[PDB]
Symmetry: C2
Subunit: 131 residues, 2 copies
């Protein structure tokens, strides 16, 4: 069983990105499985009416098309603040409720190694760039 | 000097070891003292003592009556992905109503993309500086 819960199945959301492969399959889950079998598949569009599963490498190009749903290679990728493809743990994560972001900028200034910060939801996260 | 980005009445101090302490009449004057020292990241000014405590390291917040803790400048108001030296995105796209994983897909699918940010409806792609 693959998780297909992170994207809408009934909003007619397609991607125009050029195909890497096309097959027909019986479910969104099966289309995800086809994506995951291809090293360079980043996302897919499955059509519930035609049963076509279009696997794609490039960045999604969203558009509207009846019966389409567009899913990622996997729903496991749930990072949103600053998210490295190769992985990069924050140097620090603090609750900064009631603080301005400029105090998170101050934290980064004062933290050796800190190249950038994020301040989503008043949480101050510090990061070093990787290499 | 804009001193409005932080609270003045919430008794917020910082324990960070200080660079120095001086006396001043206002938070704005404390911020000025902070800006005169190259390594001052933040300060705690106290309403009652009139002491302005200039600090280099990361804030260490705590509660202390009459304290207020401000940054070197309120102007550093970036809150998404904020590079200390600046960094323009490779790409900025409208991904309203999409899971973060589809922004991950966008970064995977974009040569040069090292990382992404997806707060709100905007999927932003970056290469490292
Ligand atoms: Cl459209
Ligand atoms: Cl690449």
């Amino acid at each position: 069983q693959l998780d297909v819960s992170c994207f809408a199945h009934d909003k007619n959301i397609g991607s125009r990105t050029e195909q890497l492969s096309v097959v027909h399959v019986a479910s969104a889950q099966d289309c995800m499985k086809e994506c995951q079998a291809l090293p360079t598949c980043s996302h897919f569009t499955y059509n519930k009416n035609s049963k076509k599963c279009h696997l794609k490498a490039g960045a999604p190009e969203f558009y509207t098309y009846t019966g389409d749903m567009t899913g990622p290679r996997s729903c496991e990728h749930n990072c949103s603040d600053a998210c490295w493809m190769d992985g990069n743990n924050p140097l620090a994560v603090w609750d900064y409720s009631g603080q301005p972001p400029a105090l998170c900028w101050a934290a980064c200034m004062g933290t050796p190694g800190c190249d950038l910060y994020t301040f989503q939801g008043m949480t101050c996260k510090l990061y070093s760039q990787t290499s």
